[PDB]
Amino acid sequence: DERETWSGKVDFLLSVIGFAVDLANVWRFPYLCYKNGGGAFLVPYGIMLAVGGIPLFYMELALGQHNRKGAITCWGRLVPLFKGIGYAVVLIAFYVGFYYNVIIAWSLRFFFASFTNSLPWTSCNNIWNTPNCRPFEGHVEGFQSAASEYFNRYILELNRSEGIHDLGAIKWDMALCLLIVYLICYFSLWKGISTSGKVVWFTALFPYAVLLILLIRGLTLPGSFLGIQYYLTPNFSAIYKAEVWVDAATQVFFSLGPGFGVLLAYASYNKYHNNVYKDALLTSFINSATSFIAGFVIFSVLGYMAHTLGVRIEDVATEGPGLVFVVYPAAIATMPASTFWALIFFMMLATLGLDSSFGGMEAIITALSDEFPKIKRNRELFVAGLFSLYFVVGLASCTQGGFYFLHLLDRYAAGYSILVAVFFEAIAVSWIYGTNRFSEDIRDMIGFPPGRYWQVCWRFVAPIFLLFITVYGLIGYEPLTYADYVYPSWANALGWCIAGSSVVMIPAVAIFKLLSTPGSLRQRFTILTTPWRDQQ
């Protein structure tokens, strides 16, 4: 009944603005604009945002505010047959924790690494470098940059691992950074939301300040406007290519994060009559806007690299960790006051992921507290038991070969697993429960029903938008590979028996409860499709 509520309304919004904005807004969206014809890419990205992303973002936020419970209890109360959807989502988020925080450490390692007059990653005459060290990025594989060799040879020591079977030594300089991450996560989430919803004031906001002072520093560099050209010069040739709508579709889904039980969790502590539809629209737009901004911060410095440093644009217009740990640092090492751009750049990368780890873990804590009161009372104890396990098994990721184990989790822990789980979320809510019954819920909350646009996006466009991604995610499938390393067969099977370790609980729990209640066969479905609110 009388469960907690955000001490302030901004605490909620920043917790959502923060969960949604992470490194993928920096090291993935600007690249897609660059690859897919500049401004023209905003067409499919907006269309996929407006019909796939915002519909699913609004939906889970509503369910969270309305049913007032974490992800397990809530799906168990909409369609009890499909209660397993909640169980699956908590697992998928549990898995992602085993590799997502390790990239926050990388950001702190380079932070504790930028306390120097001469940043270490700029020169090719260190002990870790090779005879094939260029000062900047190239397009020949055997000859890496002074910052690709700093990252892959001093920070990581990935060179001393023959593959996933060879983990080798624990880098305790990194294992210390991982503990600093889970310490920050513990003392932000342990005493509940009253404290959490305050830390997001720094972690959700600090990036906007660094983005601003790096935007000025980026746009005032010789050649910055040439980067913006590479970033946004429209080329509508690509809008006619199918493999572009999939990049839009896939960026839209994995950047807003609907269906992972976090907006559900966060909204469950809203007041019942909060204008969550306005909270969806506001929060969403702020995500996509934060990527558009970041893309100037990148391609300004990318053009300056291409004009005053002699590097092909193709060779620095990268995505993923390489762009923020190798390319962009190596551009900072040239500009004056480099030490300052580093320290704020890495402190930005760190605070960008902490927001998101909070919500991923808060979805877990909430979902179980609302179902296992044995742990709802015992909270401070519980999270210590979660993070310690995360840390302990996370020592595996602080090895010389750790990265191989991470790329693996990166592909299977929340891959097609979350796509198919969210597919049964759209179907459960729109079809089994009922769009009409859902709108009547929404009316009672904010006072009006969802427009027909929203209701058509919920029973038709959403499951097809998802299906659209999931099918093409299987069309262009390949076996798992990093550089010349090809992961063994048993690594992939290990990965599948991780993606399935969550989806299977959808039909398993649907099979368990179906065989746990008395009655006739149809008589069972009807009892396992009647919501908890209708039975009283």
């Epitope: 009409n436 019954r437 709108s439 009547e440 009316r443 009672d444 006072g447 009006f448 029903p449 609110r533 209708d534």
Partner: antibody, heavy 119, light 109 residues
């Protein structure tokens, strides 16, 4: 084209019980929540009970709660109001109003049916 | 119960003149939740103004709404004889739902 016509109702003795009816036509009744508003002979409007578009959310007034019951029939487009334990204070014309959007008020009102509660 | 009080209770007015009438809540009301109904003698009420200032369908442009918080006002730029009615404000923001006490508009002669 949308039209509400209320029905039933007349003279009851105190403690009696009556059931009023509102016949919706000209729109998709099931998509809109409805509410009973009454008007005393002193010409004072008073809200009585709201019923959500699917009847799962139902708000009464403190002056009729425990005595009055509101219900829907989206199959035949009828809105009912079962009154028990009637009192002379319940004497009014009873109106049937259509209000699905709280930010828009009651967009369509019926025509009234009269209840006298006298011995 | 959010008691709404309308003032004046009765005002007479010559056609062409400008008339203002006030609605006063005992508890603040969000401006998107305060509406106005007209009721003519022997007939049912009609929705006239919703969300403080938005005119309902068929309402001539000589009517306006203003106000916010606990004080709101209906205003008729130049009155006509077909406006002689009783005006009720309504609050839709909390339960129980409450109607004002009425303003009666009569024609001066």
């Amino acid at each position: 084209e949308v039209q509400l016509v209320e029905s039933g109702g007349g003279l009851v003795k105190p403690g009696g019980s009556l059931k009023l009816s509102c016949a919706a036509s000209g729109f998709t009744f099931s998509s809109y929540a409805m509410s009973w508003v009454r008007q005393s002979p002193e010409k004072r409007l008073e809200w009585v009970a709201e019923i959500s578009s699917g009847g799962r959310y139902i708000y009464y007034s403190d002056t009729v709660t425990g005595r009055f019951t509101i219900s829907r029939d989206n199959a035949r487009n009828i809105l009912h109001l079962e009154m028990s334990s009637l009192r002379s204070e319940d004497t009014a014309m009873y109106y049937c109003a259509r209000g699905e959007v709280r930010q828009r008020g009651f967009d369509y009102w019926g025509q009234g049916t009269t209840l006298t509660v006298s011995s | 119960e959010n008691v709404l009080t309308q003032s004046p209770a009765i005002m007479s007015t010559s056609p062409g003149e400008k008339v203002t009438m006030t609605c006063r809540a005992s508890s603040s009301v969000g401006s998107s939740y305060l509406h106005w109904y007209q009721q003519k003698s022997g007939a049912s009420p009609k929705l006239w103004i919703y969300s403080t200032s938005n005119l309902a369908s068929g309402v001539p442009a000589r009517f306006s709404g203003s106000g916010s918080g606990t004080s709101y006002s209906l205003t008729i730029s130049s009155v006509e004889a077909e406006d002689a009615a009783t005006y009720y404000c309504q609050q839709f923001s909390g339960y129980p739902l409450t109607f004002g006490s009425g303003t009666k508009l009569e024609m001066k002669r």
